[PDB]
Amino acid sequence: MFVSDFRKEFYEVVQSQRVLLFVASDVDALCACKILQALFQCDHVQYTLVPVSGWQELETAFLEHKEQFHYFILINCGANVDLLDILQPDEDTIFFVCDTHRPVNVVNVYNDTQIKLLIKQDDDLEVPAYEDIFRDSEPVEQTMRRRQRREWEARRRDILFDYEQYEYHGTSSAMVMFELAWMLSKDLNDMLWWAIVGLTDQWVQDKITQMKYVTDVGVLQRHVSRHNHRNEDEENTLSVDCTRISFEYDLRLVLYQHWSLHDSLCNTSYTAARFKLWSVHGQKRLQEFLADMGLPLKQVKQKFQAMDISLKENLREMIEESANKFGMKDMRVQTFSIHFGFKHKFLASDVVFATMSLMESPEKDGSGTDHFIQALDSLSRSNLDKLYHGLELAKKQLRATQQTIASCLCTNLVISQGPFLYCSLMEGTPDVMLFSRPASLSLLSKHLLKSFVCSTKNRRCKLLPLVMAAPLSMEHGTVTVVGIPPETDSSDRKNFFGRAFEKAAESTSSRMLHNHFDLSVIELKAEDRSKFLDALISLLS
């Protein structure tokens, strides 16, 4: 069931109890976690944080802890599966699920005793009616009933199929948690920023539509203005500090405030794809764009911070003018920035890329948990050192992304299988270890598809979805496979590959695991890849 009162039904229930907090490995989840942690600190809630990358870790951790805890909180995991069936818990165990994954499992929706969904009830939700999916030598009296039961069960299969076909995401969990803090009158300025970063994570990863993003930006604008007014109230005692969040109609250029304009232009998907920067011709057109701006060469190639103050104040208008001249209409974006002092100013997307690079780091200097915690720590104002380190890792990730895309396109490795495009990375692919985790591979695939649609002349191919594979375990001969929807500005960002992969694996008896919280990312036996993809082609044709 859904929670109608976050205070009485959730927070006041758990704050006096011992709580196990499961947190998925995405920035929105980290941000939601930071907010809840700050609340739990204020109220001295006894809890244990268990970071989880996928279902196996969660299920294992649950077995390890189910005896010492009866109150569980799941952040960005659990909503899209029959949680009671998978975990097989005791009757007294309560699960609070704050997860953006859609669709919500019907059992999670209609269970009243153990599943408590911390999900806004006015989210995009189209749940089936209870009557359609749950029930309570023979004469005609009995056989007619049998016939009706069979027809009901048949409709039920169709109804649940339609309901579970497309995966997508609802409102940011960080935003939901911020609302809780607001209700508790404990919404610190830091929490509002974390809510913003969480929303921005969804946007960066194309998890939500442009319309939903703009709508939610509008909501957060209200809170930013309320906080600004609060920071001017002399009688206010809550979160009295100098930390200022500001709404920004800023440039669609990644990390541009932390390296050169040239680097940002070359490593932003929007411009890299549209200028076709994998080609010399493309690189030439970019130089013509920079020439049309009339900006000096030194000012473009040097770090942004060392730019003439007069040029910084005109850059938004200058770049947008040249952009309009080249027919680019979306150089400007609605977002937020946070200011600490001096040059310590960060756009929301900067923090997303930094936090993501820390969390998804493939380094051996620490385990996945260490990196997760480092990412979680980087969100605290207390020290910006981790954030700045994250920004350096982000630059590397972005450069490697551009190089990988160039290799894929110039080596002609993005090939239509009919109903979908296919491409893959191999063990010998440079920087493959930067793209071997679900999150990193999925984001790479979306960036690659964006560049591909700009590159291709084939009108049919422009509208195709993409399937992308990378090496998982060489020892066990497994690969990770991701599926993403067709790339369009107006996309509803809904994804059918989860159930498509499932049916393809079943009809071929392929050895496959749905370990990621998104069903559109699977682990597959390399030996089965051939028949698996063959079945998938037939299925989607």
Author numbering: 1 to 136, 162 to 566
Quote the original article.
Extensive experimental evidence has since demonstrated that cell division cycle protein 45 (Cdc45) is required throughout the process of DNA replication: it is essential for establishment of an initiation complex at DNA origins, and for chromosome unwinding and DNA synthesis at replication forks. More recently, Cdc45 was shown to be an integral component of the Cdc45-MCM-GINS (CMG) assembly responsible for DNA unwinding in the replisome.
The X-ray crystal structure of human Cdc45 was solved at 2.1 Å using the anomalous signal of crystals derivatized with the mercury compound thimerosal. A construct with an 11-residue excision (lacking amino acids S154 to I164) crystallized readily and was used for high-resolution structure determination. Crystallographic analysis reveals that human Cdc45 adopts a compact, disk-like shape, resulting from folding of the polypeptide chain into a closed arc, from its N- to the C-terminus. The only deviation from a globular fold is represented by a large helical insertion in the DHH domain, spanning amino acids L118 to S197, which projects away from the folded core of Cdc45 (discussed in detail later); the insertion consists of the low complexity, acidic region, which is almost entirely disordered, followed by the seven-turn helix α6 pointing away from the Cdc45 fold. Our crystallographic analysis shows that Cdc45 bears a remarkable three-dimensional similarity to the RecJ exonuclease, which reveals their homology despite very little sequence identity. The structure shows that the DHHA1 loop reaches down across the groove that separates it from the DHH domain and inserts F542 in a hydrophobic pocket on the DHH domain surface, lined by residues A24, G54, W55 and C77 and with V52, L58 as its base. As a result of these interactions, the DHHA1 domain latches onto the DHH domain, causing the steric occlusion of the inter-domain groove, which represents the ssDNA-binding site in RecJ. At its core lies a three-stranded antiparallel β-sheet (β6-8) sandwiched between a long helix (α9) and a helical bundle (α10-14).
